[PDB]
Amino acid sequence: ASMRVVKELEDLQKKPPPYLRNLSSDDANVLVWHALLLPDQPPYHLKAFNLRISFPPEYPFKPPMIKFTTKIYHPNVDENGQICLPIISSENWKPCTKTCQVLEALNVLVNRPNIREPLRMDLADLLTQNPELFRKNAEEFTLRFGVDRP
């Protein structure tokens, strides 16, 4: 798995997408990566958010795991930074899927909230019922906990 992952990481580090910065593996574990996500959706565009990508031994035959380590106020990220990213679902996971697609899809998850299957139902309700109050809450939380935007 390490060999495939290093090839993937190497390609991503040389051709990074604009919304991913500082892509790097863990000191001695090439199966854990760290990166900053730079979302464009207001008010998330003000900061960046660190994520941890963990690759299983069986990769690419089992999906990677992704969580945020930076606190984020979002209906589709829980308070421990877990997400339900459809593309890496054990159900949807296909061994042809590359991590560049997975990160692109994560970028989508953050930029386009899905109020239909949220991890934080009260935030989804708020986002729908009073989007301005949601934006105020999210902005405050973003400015408080977000990582400085590269």
Swiss-Prot record:
Induction: By IFNB1/IFN-beta. CDD domains: UBCc_UBE2L3 (cd23801). The keyword Transferase applies. One of its GO terms (cellular component) is nucleus. It catalyses: S-ubiquitinyl-[E1 ubiquitin-activating enzyme]-L-cysteine + [E2 ubiquitin-conjugating enzyme]-L-cysteine = [E1 ubiquitin-activating enzyme]-L-cysteine + S-ubiquitinyl-[E2 ubiquitin-conjugating enzyme]-L-cysteine. The active site is at residue 84. Pathway: Protein modification; protein ubiquitination. It holds the Pfam family UQ_con. One of its GO terms (molecular function) is ubiquitin binding. Its EC number is 2.3.2.23. Present in natural killer cells (at protein level). Keywords: Transferase, Ubl conjugation, Ubl conjugation pathway. ISGylated. Residues 1-147 form the UBC core domain. One of its GO terms (biological process) is innate immune response. SMART domains: UBCc. Catalyzes the covalent attachment of ubiquitin or ISG15 to other proteins. Functions in the E6/E6-AP-induced ubiquitination of p53/TP53. Promotes ubiquitination and subsequent proteasomal degradation of FLT3. Belongs to the ubiquitin-conjugating enzyme family. Interacts with RNF19A, RNF19B and RNF144B. Interacts with FLT3 (tyrosine phosphorylated). This is Ubiquitin/ISG15-conjugating enzyme E2 L6. It comes from Homo sapiens.
